[PDB]
C-alpha cells in the first residue's frame, strides 16, 4: 500500500436528507366586479354580488397562476368566472355581522357564511358616502369538488377567504 492525505480544498464530506415544509399560498385576483347595496343608517348589507375572473388569479408566481387555469384546478376555459351572491345578512351590531351566500366555483354551487367586519363608515370630505369592511371564512375544497386529483395532504382542504373592500357611493 501507500498513504494519502486529503486535499481538504477538493474533498466534500457530504449528505442529502429529504424534508417537508408547510407554508401558506397567499393570492388574490386582479380582475373582478361587484354590486354593493348598504345602509349606513342601520349598518346592513342589502345586496352583495361578486364576479371574479379566474384568469386574473395572482399568487405571485406566473407558472402557478397558469397551472391554476388547467383541468385539474379552475378549468378557466370551461368556467371562466367564480361568483358570490349574498342571500341574507344577519347583523350582530354596527361592526359585525354574519353574511350568507352562494359561492360558485367551476360550476359547483354551495351556500357559505362569511364574517363581515365593518372597518369604517363615513361621509367623505366631498359629501359622498364611503365604507370599509372585510368578509372572511373558511371553505372546503371537498365541498366544491375542487382540484379533486390533488390530495388533501399536499394541499389543504381548507381555503381561507379574506375580502377587504374600500368602496364609495355611485353616480
- Tell me if 159 contacts ligand LFA by CB under 6 A: yes
Task: Provide the strand spans (E) within 79-141.
Answer: 81-91, 96-105, 108-123, 129-140
Q: What DSSP state is assigned to residue 26?
A: P
| Part of the chain binding ligand MNB (CB under 6 A), chosen from 13-21, 66-74, 146-154, 159-167 | 159-167
Contact letters for ligand LFA, residues 41-70 (x by CB under 6 A): -----------------------x------
Contact letters for ligand MNB, residues 32-71 (x by CB under 6 A): ----------------------------------------
62: helix, strand or coil: helix
Please list, in sequence order, all residues whose beta carbon lies within 8 angstroms of the beta carbon of residue 117, skipping any fewer than 6 positions away. 95, 96, 133, 134, 135, 136
Closer CB to ligand LFA, 64 or 75, in the complex: 64
The residue with its CB nearest to ligand MNB is 162
Footprint of ligand LFA on 120-139 (CB under 6 A): none
Distances (CA, A) of 9 to 1, 6, 13, 59, 165: 24, 8, 11, 43, 59
Footprint of ligand LFA on 3-22 (CB under 6 A): none
55: helix, strand or coil: helix
- Tell me if 25 contacts ligand LFA by CB under 6 A: yes
Beta-bridge partner residues of 48: 36
State the cell numbers at 75.
Answer: 378549468
31: helix, strand or coil: coil
* Among residues 38, 45, 84, 133, the one that binds ligand LFA under rule CB under 6 A: 84
* Among residues 87, 155, 166, 168, the one that binds ligand LFA under rule CB under 6 A: 155
- Tell me if 34 contacts ligand LFA by CB under 6 A: no
The one of ligand MNB, ligand LFA, none whose footprint includes residue 134, by CB under 5 to 8 A per kind, is ligand MNB
Instruction: Answer yes or no: are the C-beta atoms of 54 and 70 closer than 8 Å.
Output: no
Amino acid at each position: 500500500m501507500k498513504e494519502y492525505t486529503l486535499d481538504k480544498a477538493h474533498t466534500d464530506v457530504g449528505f442529502k436528507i429529504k424534508h417537508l415544509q408547510i407554508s401558506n399560498v397567499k393570492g388574490n385576483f386582479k380582475d373582478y366586479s361587484a354590486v354593493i347595496d348598504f345602509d349606513p343608517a342601520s349598518a346592513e348589507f342589502k345586496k352583495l354580488d361578486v364576479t371574479i375572473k379566474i384568469a386574473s388569479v395572482n399568487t405571485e408566481n406566473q407558472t402557478r397562476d397558469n397551472h391554476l387555469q388547467q383541468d385539474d384546478f379552475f378549468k378557466a376555459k370551461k368556467y371562466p368566472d367564480m361568483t358570490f351572491t349574498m342571500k341574507k345578512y344577519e347583523k350582530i351590531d354596527n361592526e359585525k355581522g354574519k353574511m350568507t351566500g352562494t359561492l360558485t366555483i367551476a360550476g359547483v354551487s354551495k351556500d357559505i357564511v362569511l364574517d363581515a367586519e365593518i372597518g369604517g363608515v363615513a361621509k367623505g370630505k366631498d359629501g359622498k358616502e364611503k365604507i370599509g369592511f372585510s368578509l372572511n371564512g373558511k371553505i372546503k375544497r371537498s365541498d366544491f369538488k375542487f382540484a379533486t386529483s390533488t390530495s388533501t395532504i399536499t394541499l389543504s382542504d381548507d381555503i381561507n377567504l379574506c375580502i377587504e373592500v374600500e368602496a364609495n357611493e355611485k353616480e
